[PDB]
Amino acid sequence: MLVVGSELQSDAQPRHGELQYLRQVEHILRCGFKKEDRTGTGTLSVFGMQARYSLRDEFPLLTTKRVFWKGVLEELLWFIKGSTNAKELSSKGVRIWDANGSRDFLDSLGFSARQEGDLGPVYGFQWRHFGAEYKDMDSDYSGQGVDQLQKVIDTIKTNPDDRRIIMCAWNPKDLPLMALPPCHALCQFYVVNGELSCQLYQRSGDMGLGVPFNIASYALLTYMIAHITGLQPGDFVHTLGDAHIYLNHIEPLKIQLQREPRPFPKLKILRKVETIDDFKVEDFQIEGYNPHPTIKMEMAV
Amino acid sequence: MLVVGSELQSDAQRHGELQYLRQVEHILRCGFKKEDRTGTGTLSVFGMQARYSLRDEFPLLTTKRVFWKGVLEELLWFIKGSTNAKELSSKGVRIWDANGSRDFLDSLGFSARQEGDLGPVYGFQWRHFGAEYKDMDSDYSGQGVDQLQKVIDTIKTNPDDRRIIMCAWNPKDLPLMALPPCHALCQFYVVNGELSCQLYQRSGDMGLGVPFNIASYALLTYMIAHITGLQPGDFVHTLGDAHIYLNHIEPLKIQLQREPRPFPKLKILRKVETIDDFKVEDFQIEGYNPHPTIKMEMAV
Ligand SMILES: Cc1nc(=O)c2cc(CN(C)c3ccc(C(=O)N[C@@H](CCC(=O)O)C(=O)O)s3)ccc2[nH]1
Ligand SMILES: Cc1nc(=O)c2cc(CN(C)c3ccc(C(=O)N[C@@H](CCC(=O)O)C(=O)O)s3)ccc2[nH]1
Ligand SMILES: O=c1ccn([C@H]2C[C@H](O)[C@@H](COP(=O)(O)O)O2)c(=O)[nH]1
Ligand SMILES: O=c1ccn([C@H]2C[C@H](O)[C@@H](COP(=O)(O)O)O2)c(=O)[nH]1
Numbered sequence A: 001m002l003v004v005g006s007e008l009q010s011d012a013q014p015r016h017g018e019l020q021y022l023r024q025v026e027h028i029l030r031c032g033f034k035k036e037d038r039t040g041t042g043t044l045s046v047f048g049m050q051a052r053y054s055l056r057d058e059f060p061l062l063t064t065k066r067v068f069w070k071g072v073l074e075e076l077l078w079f080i081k082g083s084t085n086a087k088e089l090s091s092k093g094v095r096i097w098d099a100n101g102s103r104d105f106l107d108s109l110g111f112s113a114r115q116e117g118d119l120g121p122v123y124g125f126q127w128r129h130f131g132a133e134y135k136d137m138d139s140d141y142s143g144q145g146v147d148q149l150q151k152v153i154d155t156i157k158t159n160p161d162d163r164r165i166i167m168c169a170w171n172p173k174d175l176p177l178m179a180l181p182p183c184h185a186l187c188q189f190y191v192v193n194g195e196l197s198c199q200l201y202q203r204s205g206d207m208g209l210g211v212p213f214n215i216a217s218y219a220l221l222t223y224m225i226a227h228i229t230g231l232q233p234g235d236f237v238h239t240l241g242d243a244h245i246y247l248n249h250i251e252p253l254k255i256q257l258q259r260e261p262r263p264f265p266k267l268k269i270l271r272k273v274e275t276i277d278d279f280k281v282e283d284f285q286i287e288g289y290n291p292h293p294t295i296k297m298e299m300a301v
Numbered sequence B: 001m002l003v004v005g006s007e008l009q010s011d012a013q014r015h016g017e018l019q020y021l022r023q024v025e026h027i028l029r030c031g032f033k034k035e036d037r038t039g040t041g042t043l044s045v046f047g048m049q050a051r052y053s054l055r056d057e058f059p060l061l062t063t064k065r066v067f068w069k070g071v072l073e074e075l076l077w078f079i080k081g082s083t084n085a086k087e088l089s090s091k092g093v094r095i096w097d098a099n100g101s102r103d104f105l106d107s108l109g110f111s112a113r114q115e116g117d118l119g120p121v122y123g124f125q126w127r128h129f130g131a132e133y134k135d136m137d138s139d140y141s142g143q144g145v146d147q148l149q150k151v152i153d154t155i156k157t158n159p160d161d162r163r164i165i166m167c168a169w170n171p172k173d174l175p176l177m178a179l180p181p182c183h184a185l186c187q188f189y190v191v192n193g194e195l196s197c198q199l200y201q202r203s204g205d206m207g208l209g210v211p212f213n214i215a216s217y218a219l220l221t222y223m224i225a226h227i228t229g230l231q232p233g234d235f236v237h238t239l240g241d242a243h244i245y246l247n248h249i250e251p252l253k254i255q256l257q258r259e260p261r262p263f264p265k266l267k268i269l270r271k272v273e274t275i276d277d278f279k280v281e282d283f284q285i286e287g288y289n290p291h292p293t294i295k296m297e298m299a300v
Helices: A017-031 A067-082 A084-092 A103-106 A123-129 A146-157 A210-229 A247-256 B017-028 B070-077 B085-089 B102-107 B122-128 B147-155 B209-228 B246-256
Strands: A031-034 A045-052 A164-167 A183-192 A195-206 A231-247 A266-269 A284-287 B030-035 B042-055 B166-169 B183-191 B193-207 B233-244 B263-266 B283-286
Touching: A017 A045, A017 A247, A031 A247, A045 B042, A045 B183, A045 B193, A045 B233, A067 A084, A067 A123, A067 A210, A067 A247, A146 A164, A146 A183, A146 B042, A146 B183, A164 B183, A183 A210, A183 B042, A183 B166, A183 B233, A195 A210, A195 B102, A195 B147, A195 B183, A210 A231, A210 A266, A231 A247, A231 B042, A231 B183, A231 B193, B017 B042, B017 B209, B017 B233, B017 B246, B070 B085, B070 B209, B122 B147, B147 B166, B147 B183, B147 B209, B183 B209, B183 B233, B193 B209, B193 B263, B209 B233, B209 B263, B209 B283
Parallel strands: A195 A231, B193 B233
Antiparallel strands: A031 A045, A045 A231, A164 A183, A183 A195, A266 A284, B030 B042, B042 B233, B166 B183, B183 B193, B263 B283
């Protein structure tokens, strides 16, 4: 039968961050329903989940399997620069978007004429140029559309009480040009007691592959914005729509659920950075990260 | 102290209604003081979720009567694409009149705008996302993305799709809105022939708007389930800044001591084929035996 580490206890929906994730996995295995999907693989699925990860002197990079930190960091810097060229990320040894920008994938979507790598008007473009007319991944979009990311930063500084501190990549007008509509549809920031928190609405979560990387990604973004606004990191709240385990991840996750978590690492920012675009890979240091080995989770395409 | 009905038990995230009451309890117990736009002040928590079954019941709160006439009229008004508060007010539903008032509009710099013109809010975004807003009574036929109809068509053709979203949050249009949407987006989901809906609500006035909003999205899900031949499943309510305005604390403490009753049922009285064809007379709420309304003032 399904056997799990004794520390999970009740999986039913802060402290002990990693257990929040492992309990969601357990809950989907135990209570999820079979749901067919776009890729033809099949999933077990639950609709509507929420987990809270404290960011207060800890950073939620999972320890029950090693997570691809280099990729998390490169990807987020790539978003920040407004990039939608998967080849530019791949040149940093981070190949996570290559499959979606491939000649054969793009062709399957009917995007014959665009260049390989061109993901269309996805996060980088929507976060920094929302509403601008997308042309291609090489076009200069300087001063075009809404720079949501800077606006969030400016609002946190001037009116931290504001309940409208949102960055949204879901753009119905642009959806048909995207190689993958965004899994992270929107995030909201919140300030109380000198702490910055972030909530992600993730419409679709591949619990074995993307979700651990995604948690680390928004935790990092929150650390970055906290740094620039002179706040301390608070909580990362992870909300999921279709939370799913692909059938070929069931056995790998069952290995993972039996591993003892270790304490989370810390993230250090190594200098005073004044603006979000000035961050560089050399500015960050993960300390004390002691994960169990990688478990291969294949990507369904 | 805070005293509450015995059936709430643990407020940590039987009845669907108890999940609302437990949220309210939780904010009073654990919430932090936070100042706000209206000047009123709140007790606040960031990030909550609750799940309301829609299976042979309808989540209209029984611990305090909820303005059902207004829920229904408002949703019909959204579906028509309207952003004109006067057209809702004419139905006896005044819930948007303050936001559309001469004085409030002027407070935002919209002195040249007609009273009642809420800007490019829900009706416009749901039916015309991406179109260029002019004014509330302009002709937007065929302009922008009809997200509502796209949702319905996707549920019919590809119920497993993980992209079935309607989003009112439009960064380009926000400066023209009299109030940026409290309901930023919603997502639909299908499994085992049941339709569920999740709402992302960025800001929830727990005393006033949130009970009304719960009923709004439940009703939407009932409508869409009907048109698509599915059964209603769950309504999942997700909150950003979940707050209690200071002048609602004592009214909500009254509420929390009332005994919940079973939820009512919602009946759809005829076969309706298109979303646009629903009318007030197509619905009946049966078995609604609430405790009396508690006045919760609207801030700003
Ligand atoms: C079905 C699917 N699931 C996903 O999670 C997904 C994620 C992305 C983008 N993304 C956010 C990521 C893609 C791959 C990642 C990753 O962490 N890879 C690790 C582990 C690989 C493995 O275990 O197979 C690595 O490459 O080392 S993180 C794109 C398409 C997707 N499609
Ligand atoms: C601060 C604020 N809180 C709100 O909840 C809010 C809600 C709307 C829109 N909306 C969705 C609603 C407004 C009023 C409602 C309502 O249920 N009214 C009842 C109860 C009134 C009362 O208790 O004072 C009614 O009119 O009978 S529902 C607009 C601005 C807002 N502003
Ligand atoms: O950062 C991301 C990008 C995507 N996905 C997953 C969710 C789905 O398994 C798949 C996207 O497929 P659709 O939901 O669009 O079908 O990738 C993630 O988990 N995180
Ligand atoms: O349907 C709605 C509309 C608004 N609000 C509340 C939340 C806030 O109390 C207020 C909006 O104020 P801001 O969050 O925009 O400041 O109205 C709701 O609860 N539901």
